Amino acid sequence: ESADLRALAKHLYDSYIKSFPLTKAKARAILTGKTSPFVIYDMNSLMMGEDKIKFKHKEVAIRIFQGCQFRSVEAVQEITEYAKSIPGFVNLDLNDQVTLLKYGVHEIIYTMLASLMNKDGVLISEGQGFMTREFLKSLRKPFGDFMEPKFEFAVKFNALELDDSDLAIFIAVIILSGDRPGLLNVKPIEDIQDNLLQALELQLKLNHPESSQLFAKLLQKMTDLRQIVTEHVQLLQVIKKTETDMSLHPLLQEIY
Amino acid sequence: QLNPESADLRALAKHLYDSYIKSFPLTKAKARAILTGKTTDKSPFVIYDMNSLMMGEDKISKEVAIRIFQGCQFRSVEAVQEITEYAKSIPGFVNLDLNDQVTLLKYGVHEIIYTMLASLMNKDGVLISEGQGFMTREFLKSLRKPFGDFMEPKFEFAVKFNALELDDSDLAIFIAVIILSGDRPGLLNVKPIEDIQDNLLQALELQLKLNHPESSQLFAKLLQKMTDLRQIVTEHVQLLQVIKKTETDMSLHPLLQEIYKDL
Numbered sequence: 001e002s003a004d005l006r007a008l009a010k011h012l013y014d015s016y017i018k019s020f021p022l023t024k025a026k027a028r029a030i031l032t033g034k035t036s037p038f039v040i041y042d043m044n045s046l047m048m049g050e051d052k053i054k055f056k057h058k059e060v061a062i063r064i065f066q067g068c069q070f071r072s073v074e075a076v077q078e079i080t081e082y083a084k085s086i087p088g089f090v091n092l093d094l095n096d097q098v099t100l101l102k103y104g105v106h107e108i109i110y111t112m113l114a115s116l117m118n119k120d121g122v123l124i125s126e127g128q129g130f131m132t133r134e135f136l137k138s139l140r141k142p143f144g145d146f147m148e149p150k151f152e153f154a155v156k157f158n159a160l161e162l163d164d165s166d167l168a169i170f171i172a173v174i175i176l177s178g179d180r181p182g183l184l185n186v187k188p189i190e191d192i193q194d195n196l197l198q199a200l201e202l203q204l205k206l207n208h209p210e211s212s213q214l215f216a217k218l219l220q221k222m223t224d225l226r227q228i229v230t231e232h233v234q235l236l237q238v239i240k241k242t243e244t245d246m247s248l249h250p251l252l253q254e255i256y
Numbered sequence: 257q258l259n260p261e262s263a264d265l266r267a268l269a270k271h272l273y274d275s276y277i278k279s280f281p282l283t284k285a286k287a288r289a290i291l292t293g294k295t296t297d298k299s300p301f302v303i304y305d306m307n308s309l310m311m312g313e314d315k316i317s318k319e320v321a322i323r324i325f326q327g328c329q330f331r332s333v334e335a336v337q338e339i340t341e342y343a344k345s346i347p348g349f350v351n352l353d354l355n356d357q358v359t360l361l362k363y364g365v366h367e368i369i370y371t372m373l374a375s376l377m378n379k380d381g382v383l384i385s386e387g388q389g390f391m392t393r394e395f396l397k398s399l400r401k402p403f404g405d406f407m408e409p410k411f412e413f414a415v416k417f418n419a420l421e422l423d424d425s426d427l428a429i430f431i432a433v434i435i436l437s438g439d440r441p442g443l444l445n446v447k448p449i450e451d452i453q454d455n456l457l458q459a460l461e462l463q464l465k466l467n468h469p470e471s472s473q474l475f476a477k478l479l480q481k482m483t484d485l486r487q488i489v490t491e492h493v494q495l496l497q498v499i500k501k502t503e504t505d506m507s508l509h510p511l512l513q514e515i516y517k518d519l
């Protein structure tokens with residue numbers, strides 16, 4: 001039966017490569033040098049990187065924060081497409097699918113964001129740039145503790161040294177989470193996740209024979225993720241309840 | 257079912273199960289026996305309202321909510337003591353840096369308390385006073401605005417957690433896994449802790465596979481529940497800040513207060 005598992009794993013990987021442009025393997029090469037990105041480490045760096053480079057993603061801290069949103073909206077579409085390739089997903093009650101993506105994207109966003117971060121910064125805009133971790137903490141208002149929580153998570157998560165083939169199955173497990181509120185038919189979901197969990201388990205055993213109980217440690221990071229999301233939602237509302245320069249075109253705000 | 261490695265894991269499971277029974281007076285087996293009525297001597301007095309509560313004082317401050325609340329404070333202080341005792345039995349635990357021992361307990365006792373509290377719960381209520389009493393979920397939710405719902409989140413977790421059908425021998429290892437968490441804030445030497453947890457994780461994994469052959473991916477499902485515990489703790493901690501402000505006259509046990517400080 002270990003046949004259908006290896007196939008599911010290969011399938012998810014191929015699909016993951018297709019849905020996500022910047023893989024971890026590719027991002028890693030750019031972060032260590034073995035392979036250059038424009039560096040944003042201070043205000044003038046920023047102003048220049050967006051001047052020469054047309055970073056598709058008023059006030060700096062605010063403009064940076066909104067670029068994060070723009071990029072997140074973009075990531076949501078990639079994740080949605082990926083999900084549809086997971087065997088059984090499209091066959092679930094349509095409302096449940098929306099529910100699963102609705103509560104799952106944030107967890108996946110931060111999970112994948114770690115692939116693009118090291119302890120010194122994060123790759124932005126397809127990796128054409130590198131925004132410094134220090135510069136992010138240099139932001140005033142509450143925009144200073146905005147990204148820090150993610151870096152800390154990334155340092156820990158990256159310590160597991162997973163690769164794209166590992167992450168592809170993990171993401172699918174995050175998506176098929178049967179405890180999301182509002183699901184109408186939980187069984188099919190948990191049934192698919194169970195199969196995905198089996199696939200992830202064999203994947204990690206064969207890909208990291210020397211890493212003891214890596215499956216357990218990866219599942220434990222689940223705790224870390226939701227805490228990051230919950231905390232994120234809190235700072236997000238604090239930005240809505242306060243801040244008056246967050247004004248965007250009516251059509252734009254609707255887009256988020 | 258072979259090698260000396262799997263043999264060491266079974267030995268560890270037995271050691272942990274043996275300590276768990278020795279450290280916790282009210283096991284899940286005894287709790288289930290009382291709840292399911294497979295007795296004529298283990299039947300609890302049920303408290304589902306005020307007069308019941310009143311009549312229970314005889315069978316088993318000044319206010320309904322606060323009295324019930326102070327009771328839970330006392331009981332969990334006692335639980336922390338039992339948990340602390342169980343912790344010393346975990347191989348390697350007492351050999352770790354003394355500060356880390358305190359840190360691990362500080363972050364693990366509540367997650368463990370709610371894990372074990374589920375053993376004493378069903379969709380309708382919870383056992384109290386070593387199983388002599390039973391307070392229904394509805395009575396506890398009818399309480400005054402503040403306390404009126406400090407328990408509901410525990411019930412919601414319990415009915416789902418109990419769905420895994422774990423038994424004491426399973427819980428003994430899981431409780432151990434929880435305590436030996438290398439990602440606790442402020443830990444000095446994270447390596448020795450992770451090494452102990454890895455071995456506990458192996459013990460738990462084998463135990464579940466052997467105890468629940470037909471329960472597919474129980475191990476992973478059990479681990480995912482850990483996120484549920486953290487959440488319970490945060491909510492509870494926030495509900496306490498609310499109470500200590502609305503009820504300026506209600507005291508909170510020092511031990512429990514030192515555990516929430518800078519949590």
Ligand SMILES: CCCOc1ccc(C[C@H](Cc2ccccc2)C(=O)O)cc1CNC(=O)c1ccc([C@]23C[C@H]4C[C@H](C[C@H](C4)C2)C3)cc1
Nearest residue numbers: 313323324326327328329331332369382383384385391512
């Ligand atoms: C009432 C059911 C509640 O049963 C709970 C609920 C939550 C906890 C966890 C605590 C709550 C807390 C939250 C905030 C701070 C600290 C801890 C925690 O998280 O630390 C423990 C118990 C276990 N409780 C019992 O077994 C139990 C035994 C005796 C009584 C009486 C108290 C008093 C009135 C009645 C008659 C006498 C005198 C006995 C009932 C009540 C409860």
